[PDB]
């Protein structure tokens, strides 16, 4: 009958990188999504299946909350059936997605004069991720036929790449914090609703 922490997933001080997106499991809840929808601060609030009005009056076994920070123009790639950097190599959603995607600008918190390089993203990979797959390996990427043994140089690049966050960037270039909710149903008494 207690309120589980939507504050520790939305108002957390520091967010994880996109290639290492944070996942939290939410169970045994009474949940009021009305304040979430009426916050009037999210630049993007969209989801698929359940109507954005009927989340509270429907019961789920448990929820998964993923959080990360990406570029603004890349927020479009967080959707089922997408392609690109994030949708292929970093964070991929299944076609039959159910949860809701929320995204808001965080320029005042994640951007500094000179360049904020703490956030990384994967750039080179042999294949595409399966849905909900996380890869944090930092093995060297071999593009050519030369079997380089962990040396960065000719035809061998470090897969992870940093991005510079400036206060002078365009609105589509500025950092955006993204939270994705996924409700799942199994042979469970559906403890999460209210």
């Amino acid at each position, epitope marked *: 009958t207690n309120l589980c922490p939507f504050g520790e997933v939305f108002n957390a001080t520091r967010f994880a990188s996109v290639y290492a997106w944070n996942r939290k499991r939410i169970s045994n809840c009474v949940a009021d999504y009305s304040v979430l929808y009426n916050s009037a601060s999210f630049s993007t609030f*969209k*989801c*698929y299946g359940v*109507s954005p009005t009927k989340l509270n009056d429907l019961c789920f076994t448990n929820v998964y909350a993923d959080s990360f920070v990406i570029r603004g123009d890349e927020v479009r*790639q967080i*959707a089922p059936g997408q*392609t690109g950097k994030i949708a*292929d190599y970093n964070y991929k959603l299944p076609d039959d997605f159910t949860g809701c995607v929320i995204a808001w600008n965080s320029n005042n918190l994640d951007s500094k004069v000179g360049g904020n390089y703490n956030y990384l993203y994967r750039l080179f990979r042999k294949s595409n991720l399966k849905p909900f797959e996380r890869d944090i390996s930092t093995e060297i990427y071999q593009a050519g036929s030369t079997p380089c043994n962990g040396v960065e140089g000719f035809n061998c690049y470090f897969p992870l790449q940093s991005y510079g966050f400036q206060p002078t960037n365009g609105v589509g270039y500025q950092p955006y914090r993204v939270v994705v909710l996924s409700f799942e149903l199994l042979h469970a008494p559906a403890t999460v609703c209210g």
Partner: antibody
Amino acid sequence: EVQLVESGGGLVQPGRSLRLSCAASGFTFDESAMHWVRQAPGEGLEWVSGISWNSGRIAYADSVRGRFTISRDNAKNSLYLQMNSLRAEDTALYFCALTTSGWFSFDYWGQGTLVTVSS
Amino acid sequence: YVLTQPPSVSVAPGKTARITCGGNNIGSKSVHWYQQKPGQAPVPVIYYDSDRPSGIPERFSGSNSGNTATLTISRVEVGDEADYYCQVWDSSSDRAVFGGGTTLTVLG
């Protein structure tokens, strides 16, 4: 400035093949998906084909599957469409459409090239 | 997936014109609106529900909820004579479905 150019369209009789080329300049062609869209004369737009940012995912329309082949080459920023076994209803204006992020929409369009098939 | 648009919409100058794009559970997808002036290539006025590309005047607005989308043009001028299409990307079968066009004729 983004500027898309189309070429390779003309007159051909049904049965044979034709190659359409699209040239891009003014953006990062290495990170954007491409689409081939079709518009019949005096009719609504119709989507034909689409290729992702690294030739990983390729999608075709239900009425052109098995006869068309889309490809891209990032070395010279080129997009190719090979058309085989053209029926009569393939006479239309073809647009080379660009999408900046993702591959859902068509952010930038080209001037298009007219392709006519008849005996 | 099937989309539905009115064949034609006529509004008086200076008013607001509303174009509706129907569909089954269209609120679970993103609707993109394209305008095509005669003898020209289509350009997007709104994409991803309500986002506006650079260079588009603020007279264009969009909404998506339920089973119908909506494109609103405030203070309709005379240079708004074009065909308006709504596009939805069906990710279940990996395709894009367009509308059917909606001519906007300005009275006067």
